[PDB]
């Protein structure tokens, strides 16, 4: 009984939303490039303890918690596959923004994001094969984008390195460019919220169901908690603990959306076509809640 | 593979891609090349 808006993909509002998302990504990267320098990146690359522990946490927890959640909640096969693909996806770039919100040594954050994406393009089909045994015996390994991952990584890294160079060359443009970028980020975020509300319409209520909401709410919170626990277990620095925990919970749901769209017809994946959106809003809300908790704890310290 | 989409780290719909001429939102998107989609008869099943 699931229905989609009559012209979902092809509409002026959706095109505007796509452009606004692109501008969000570019300006977020540009504004984030101010807080990192080459020397710290080199230092973190030379000492791979944090990088390795972050990869281990992400790629040994996210698919694992996805599979465990699906088995525990006795989800439908399509839903279990959807959350499994979401878990197998690399960490998104929203983790970098969240780490900036907790002043979390952004050099390690960007290094972890880049290495996580690069390791994803290799080992995501492997995790899909070794975790989808029992649901969808189909291959599902040629449906994962490969060249798109590399192009997206390069296109993300370009504005960040532009900002880093602009920093290292001449600080004087921080108070002339960062404030403007923050302003455009704010207006574009408001536009994104209203445009998603307009585009989705009332079809989201089909996605609303006690099982999908439960899994998509448990997944990012479990990711944050497990990342924090595992990073603190290895006697890592507190700033490193915070950034690792915040990165391991964030996910790139766009890959899951494209993979599910390619693998199956729209009628098979009808009600959970909005699952990436649910995961995105829930991870955003939980990140904001953690931001508020951290700032309240800081006030408690002072 | 058959997926030629440039994923956007901030994105929740299949048309959110970092591609200059936004064909994914046009009438004829061409980021996927799999016509042999699996109908998956046991999709709506629990184990």
């Amino acid at each position, epitope marked *: 009984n699931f229905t989609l808006p009559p012209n979902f993909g092809k509409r002026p509002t959706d095109l505007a939303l796509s452009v606004i998302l692109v501008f969000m990504l570019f300006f977020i990267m540009l504004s984030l490039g101010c807080t990192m320098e080459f020397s710290k990146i080199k230092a973190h690359l030379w000492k791979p303890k944090g990088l390795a522990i972050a990869l281990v946490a992400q790629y040994g927890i996210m698919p694992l918690t996805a599979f465990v959640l699906g088995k525990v909640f006795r989800l439908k096969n399509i839903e279990a596959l959807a959350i499994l693909v979401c878990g197998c996806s690399p960490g998104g770039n929203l983790s970098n923004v969240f780490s900036l919100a907790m002043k979390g040594d952004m050099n390690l954050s960007i290094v972890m994001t880049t290495c996580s994406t690069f390791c994803a393009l290799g080992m995501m089909p492997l995790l899909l094969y070794i975790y989808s045994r029992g649901i969808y015996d189909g291959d599902l390994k040629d449906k994962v984008p490969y060249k798109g991952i590399v192009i997206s990584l390069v296109l993300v890294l370009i504005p960040c390195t532009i900002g880093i160079v602009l920093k290292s060359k001449r600080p004087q443009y921080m108070r002339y460019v960062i404030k403007g970028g923050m302003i455009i980020i704010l207006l574009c975020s408001v536009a994104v919220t209203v445009l998603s509300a307009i585009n989705v319409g009332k079809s989201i209520m089909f996605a609303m169901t006690p099982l999908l909401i439960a899994t998509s709410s448990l997944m990012p919170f479990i990711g944050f908690l497990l990342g924090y626990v595992l990073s603190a277990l290895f006697c890592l620095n507190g700033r490193c603990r915070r950034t690792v925990s915040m990165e391991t919970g964030c996910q790139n749901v766009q890959l899951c959306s494209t993979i599910l769209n390619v693998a199956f017809p729209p009628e098979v994946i009808g009600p959970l076509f909005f699952f990436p959106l649910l995961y995105m809003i829930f991870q955003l809300g939980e990140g904001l809640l953690l931001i508020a908790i951290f700032w309240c704890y800081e006030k408690f310290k002072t | 593979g058959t997926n030629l989409s440039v994923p956007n780290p901030l994105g929740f719909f299949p048309d959110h891609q970092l591609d200059p001429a936004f064909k994914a939102n046009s009438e004829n998107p061409d980021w996927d*090349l799999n016509p042999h989609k699996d109908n998956w008869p046991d999709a709506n099943k629990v184990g």
Partner: antibody
Amino acid sequence: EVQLQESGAELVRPGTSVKMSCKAAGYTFTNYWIGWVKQRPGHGLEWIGDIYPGGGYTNYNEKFKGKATLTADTSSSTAYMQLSSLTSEDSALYYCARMKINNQAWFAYWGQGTLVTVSA
Amino acid sequence: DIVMTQSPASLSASVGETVTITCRASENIYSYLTWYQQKQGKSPQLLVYNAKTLAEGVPSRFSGSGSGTQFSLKINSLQPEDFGSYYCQHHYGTPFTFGTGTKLEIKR
């Protein structure tokens, strides 16, 4: 104008292989699927298999899986089918067809057809 | 595997007479069906795709309407230029079955 050109009529004794070509013109030929359809004069149509010339990805009908082989040869832009072992059953008219979206499986442009007769 | 069947195996109609042909699918295919028209001694040509939209360069008199398991192809005004077999096909499954034929012939 996109056009598909077939090789021509063939007459082959049973048990021997035969291959036919579908030269494509008027478009890139590298980013569009090609499907092969076999039609008997006294029966309906049936779908043999599909080939993507860009990457060589192919999908085959289960019935024709054993005795159909598809090749791209993107340099000359001529798709090929190999019939492998031949019997009197598979004497029909063979069509090469191209999709339009690469996402849906309705063919838009068809070749002139290749007639294959199997008999000793 | 999905089996496609066409109701009228043969059908005769004079020029300028409305006529419909019915297609039936074994399972639900969510209007993933396309109509082909083949003339005598010619390769088949795409006529209607997705069971509703008319292909490029086709006369406007053709019309198709259906979803699920029942499909139809009205011709409305009948012209001598179109007289031949008509075929169906689905994209839902992998085997892509083609269904049987439906021949249109002159009436006298």
